[PDB]
Scaffold this motif. Structure first.
Motif, PDB file in Angstrom:
ATOM      1  N   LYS A   1      -9.244  -2.656  -2.948  1.00 60.50           N
ATOM      2  CA  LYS A   1      -8.913  -3.865  -3.695  1.00 60.50           C
ATOM      3  C   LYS A   1     -10.123  -4.778  -3.845  1.00 60.50           C
ATOM      4  CE  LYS A   1      -5.261  -4.752  -1.195  1.00 60.50           C
ATOM      5  NZ  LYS A   1      -4.331  -5.757  -0.621  1.00 60.50           N
TER       6      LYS A   1
ATOM      7  N   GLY B   1       3.419  -9.762  -7.377  1.00 62.57           N
ATOM      8  CA  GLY B   1       3.789  -9.103  -6.139  1.00 62.57           C
ATOM      9  C   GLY B   1       2.786  -9.364  -5.034  1.00 62.57           C
ATOM     10  N   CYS B   2       2.507 -10.646  -4.777  1.00 63.68           N
ATOM     11  CA  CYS B   2       1.427 -11.049  -3.879  1.00 63.68           C
ATOM     12  C   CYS B   2       1.663 -10.652  -2.426  1.00 63.68           C
ATOM     13  CB  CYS B   2       1.218 -12.566  -3.964  1.00 63.68           C
ATOM     14  SG  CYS B   2       2.679 -13.558  -3.518  1.00 63.68           S
ATOM     15  N   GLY B   3       2.912 -10.454  -2.012  1.00 63.38           N
ATOM     16  CA  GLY B   3       3.163 -10.111  -0.620  1.00 63.38           C
ATOM     17  C   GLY B   3       2.931 -11.296   0.302  1.00 63.38           C
TER      18      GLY B   3
ATOM     19  N   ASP C   1       6.214 -13.342  -5.845  1.00 59.26           N
ATOM     20  CA  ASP C   1       6.799 -12.199  -5.160  1.00 59.26           C
ATOM     21  C   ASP C   1       8.314 -12.334  -5.201  1.00 59.26           C
ATOM     22  OD1 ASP C   1       7.709 -10.389  -2.828  1.00 59.26           O
ATOM     23  OD2 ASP C   1       5.559  -9.968  -2.901  1.00 59.26           O
ATOM     24  N   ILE C   2       8.998 -11.206  -5.002  1.00 62.17           N
ATOM     25  CA  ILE C   2      10.454 -11.220  -5.053  1.00 62.17           C
ATOM     26  C   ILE C   2      11.039 -11.744  -3.749  1.00 62.17           C
ATOM     27  CG2 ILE C   2      10.783  -8.858  -4.229  1.00 62.17           C
ATOM     28  CD1 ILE C   2      13.012  -8.627  -6.427  1.00 62.17           C
TER      29      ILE C   2
ATOM     30  N   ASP D   1      11.941 -12.353  -9.407  1.00 61.16           N
ATOM     31  CA  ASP D   1      11.981 -10.920  -9.692  1.00 61.16           C
ATOM     32  C   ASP D   1      11.244 -10.715 -11.008  1.00 61.16           C
ATOM     33  OD1 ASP D   1      12.584  -8.253 -10.369  1.00 61.16           O
ATOM     34  OD2 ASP D   1      14.570  -8.366  -9.451  1.00 61.16           O
ATOM     35  N   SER D   2      10.009 -10.221 -10.927  1.00 58.03           N
ATOM     36  CA  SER D   2       9.203 -10.066 -12.129  1.00 58.03           C
ATOM     37  C   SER D   2       9.648  -8.898 -12.999  1.00 58.03           C
ATOM     38  CB  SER D   2       7.731  -9.914 -11.759  1.00 58.03           C
ATOM     39  OG  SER D   2       7.168 -11.181 -11.465  1.00 58.03           O
ATOM     40  N   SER D   3      10.555  -8.054 -12.514  1.00 60.73           N
ATOM     41  CA  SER D   3      11.150  -7.011 -13.337  1.00 60.73           C
ATOM     42  C   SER D   3      12.452  -7.461 -13.988  1.00 60.73           C
ATOM     43  CB  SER D   3      11.389  -5.744 -12.507  1.00 60.73           C
ATOM     44  OG  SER D   3      12.530  -5.871 -11.675  1.00 60.73           O
TER      45      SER D   3
ATOM     46  N   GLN E   1      -1.112  -4.994  -7.316  1.00 56.19           N
ATOM     47  CA  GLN E   1      -1.574  -3.987  -6.371  1.00 56.19           C
ATOM     48  C   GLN E   1      -0.394  -3.460  -5.563  1.00 56.19           C
ATOM     49  OE1 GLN E   1      -4.731  -3.318  -6.828  1.00 56.19           O
ATOM     50  NE2 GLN E   1      -5.158  -5.121  -8.092  1.00 56.19           N
ATOM     51  N   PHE E   2      -0.127  -2.160  -5.687  1.00 58.22           N
ATOM     52  CA  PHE E   2       0.972  -1.503  -4.977  1.00 58.22           C
ATOM     53  C   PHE E   2       2.309  -2.173  -5.293  1.00 58.22           C
ATOM     54  CE2 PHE E   2      -2.060   0.851  -2.380  1.00 58.22           C
ATOM     55  CZ  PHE E   2      -3.140  -0.005  -2.318  1.00 58.22           C
ATOM     56  N   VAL E   3       2.565  -2.414  -6.581  1.00 58.72           N
ATOM     57  CA  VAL E   3       3.740  -3.195  -6.971  1.00 58.72           C
ATOM     58  C   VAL E   3       4.506  -2.564  -8.131  1.00 58.72           C
ATOM     59  CG1 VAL E   3       4.580  -5.412  -7.800  1.00 58.72           C
ATOM     60  CG2 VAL E   3       2.723  -5.352  -6.157  1.00 58.72           C
TER      61      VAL E   3
ATOM     62  N   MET F   1       8.169  -6.303 -16.228  1.00 55.78           N
ATOM     63  CA  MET F   1       7.010  -6.495 -15.362  1.00 55.78           C
ATOM     64  C   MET F   1       5.713  -6.434 -16.159  1.00 55.78           C
ATOM     65  SD  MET F   1       6.310  -5.194 -11.535  1.00 55.78           S
ATOM     66  CE  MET F   1       7.757  -6.208 -11.230  1.00 55.78           C
TER      67      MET F   1
HETATM   68  N1  SFG Z   1      10.386  -6.826  -8.985  1.00 55.95           N
HETATM   69  C1  SFG Z   1       9.445  -7.332  -8.003  1.00 55.95           C
HETATM   70  N2  SFG Z   1       8.985  -8.500  -8.423  1.00 55.95           N
HETATM   71  C2  SFG Z   1       8.083  -9.180  -7.673  1.00 55.95           C
HETATM   72  N3  SFG Z   1       7.654  -8.668  -6.496  1.00 55.95           N
HETATM   73  C3  SFG Z   1       8.121  -7.483  -6.071  1.00 55.95           C
HETATM   74  C4  SFG Z   1       9.009  -6.810  -6.808  1.00 55.95           C
HETATM   75  N4  SFG Z   1       9.312  -5.674  -6.165  1.00 55.95           N
HETATM   76  C5  SFG Z   1       8.606  -5.647  -5.029  1.00 55.95           C
HETATM   77  N5  SFG Z   1       7.873  -6.764  -4.970  1.00 55.95           N
HETATM   78  C6  SFG Z   1       6.964  -7.146  -3.918  1.00 55.95           C
HETATM   79  O1  SFG Z   1       5.572  -6.352  -4.097  1.00 55.95           O
HETATM   80  C7  SFG Z   1       5.054  -6.214  -2.901  1.00 55.95           C
HETATM   81  C8  SFG Z   1       4.669  -4.730  -2.646  1.00 55.95           C
HETATM   82  C9  SFG Z   1       3.540  -4.630  -1.615  1.00 55.95           C
HETATM   83  N6  SFG Z   1       3.338  -3.230  -1.294  1.00 55.95           N
HETATM   84  C10 SFG Z   1       2.232  -5.214  -2.161  1.00 55.95           C
HETATM   85  C11 SFG Z   1       1.819  -6.442  -1.346  1.00 55.95           C
HETATM   86  C12 SFG Z   1       0.448  -6.988  -1.773  1.00 55.95           C
HETATM   87  N7  SFG Z   1       0.381  -7.150  -3.217  1.00 55.95           N
HETATM   88  C13 SFG Z   1      -0.673  -6.063  -1.290  1.00 55.95           C
HETATM   89  O2  SFG Z   1      -1.358  -5.398  -2.115  1.00 55.95           O
HETATM   90  O3  SFG Z   1      -0.913  -5.970  -0.055  1.00 55.95           O
HETATM   91  C14 SFG Z   1       6.128  -6.676  -1.893  1.00 55.95           C
HETATM   92  O4  SFG Z   1       5.784  -7.885  -1.371  1.00 55.95           O
HETATM   93  C15 SFG Z   1       7.409  -6.799  -2.738  1.00 55.95           C
HETATM   94  O5  SFG Z   1       8.304  -7.851  -2.161  1.00 55.95           O
END
Ligand code: SFG
Length: 271
Positions: free
Chosen positions: A11, A36-38, A58-59, A92-94, A115-117, A131
């Motif tokens: 990243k 999807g900041c986590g 984030d959701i 919920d971005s979706s 990232q990973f989302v 999304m």
């Molecule tokens: N529809 C959605 N809308 C927004 N956030 C979501 C959604 N689905 C999953 N997420 C979030 O995306 C993140 C997935 C994580 N693997 C990524 C965390 C962070 N972006 C990182 O790269 O470390 C989680 O925090 C989820 O809660």
């Protein structure tokens, strides 16, 4: 630990490349959307990037508030002289249009980082399209949509090579519901990483993602496997030394197998 650390390096190098692409035009007022900041594990990368505004969404409301407190923790360092301003949005971005939640509905972004989302939004067509809209619609022309997602090609290749509906090693396991059935949306599999979680994901056929991004006037910059990306970026010496500072010169074979399921991608908004 080492997989988390390696993903942070990926990243960092990815954000770094495209911050400089953005700065090779507008060095001023760099605005970023972290979809999807986590828990806020990218805040310090945006700080080192010296951006102006960051929208984290984030959701999970729990995650958004730990991300907001982690930002406030950072800005009360003495190191944070001009840390970026930020807003934090639970959504919920979706399913929800994020511009309905901005303090400025007409704001524009130079980068959207996802990232990973995005593979959680391929549950259905409307969710994947929503999304992409939340990620790309407010990008300025010449801005970037960057992110990381599992490589469906490598996922299927390993599932067919297996004789069960599962594959992996001691680090990770992937379990599909049925073999030979790969719908464009809702193709559900379970990804288990031994240490962390157990969350259901959906298959992302990347040519489809590439075609849907065109709806928001996005052109593919590049698409690389994690291995192709590593091999290319490791040739730049400051990338190579960042790898050695982070203690990543020796990933196990089992960790390379896990991390090689992923790809990085970059789209650019046209004029
Ligand atoms: N529809 C959605 N809308 C927004 N956030 C979501 C959604 N689905 C999953 N997420 C979030 O995306 C993140 C997935 C994580 N693997 C990524 C965390 C962070 N972006 C990182 O790269 O470390 C989680 O925090 C989820 O809660």
């Amino acid at each position: 630990f080492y997989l988390r650390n390696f993903n942070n390096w990926m990243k960092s190098v990815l954000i770094g490349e495209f911050l400089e692409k953005v700065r090779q035009k507008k060095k001023r007022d760099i605005t970023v959307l972290d979809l999807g900041c986590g828990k806020g594990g990218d805040l310090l990368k945006w700080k080192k990037g010296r951006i102006n505004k960051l929208v984290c969404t984030d959701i999970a409301d729990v995650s958004v508030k730990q991300c907001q407190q982690r930002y406030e923790d950072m800005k009360n360092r003495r190191d944070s002289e001009y840390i970026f301003s930020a807003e934090f949005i639970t959504a919920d971005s979706s399913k929800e249009l994020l511009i309905d939640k901005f303090r400025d509905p007409q704001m524009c972004f130079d980068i959207c980082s996802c990232q990973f989302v995005c593979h959680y939004s391929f549950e259905s067509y409307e969710q994947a399209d929503m999304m992409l809209r939340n990620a790309c619609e407010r990008l300025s022309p010449g801005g970037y949509f960057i992110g990381t997602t599992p490589n469906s090609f490598e996922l299927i290749r390993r599932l067919e090579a297996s004789e069960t509906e599962s594959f992996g090693n001691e680090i990770y396991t992937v379990k599909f519901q049925k073999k030979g059935d790969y719908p464009l949306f809702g193709c559900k599999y379970d990804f288990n990483l031994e240490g962390v979680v157990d969350v259901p994901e959906f298959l992302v056929y990347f040519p489809l993602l590439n075609e849907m991004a065109k709806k928001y006037n996005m052109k593919l910059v590049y698409k690389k496997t994690f291995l192709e990306f590593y091999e290319e970026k490791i040739k730049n010496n400051e990338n190579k030394m960042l790898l050695k500072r982070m203690g990543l010169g020796c990933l196990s074979k089992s960790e390379w197998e896990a991390t090689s399921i992923y790809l990085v991608f970059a789209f650019e908004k046209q004029q």
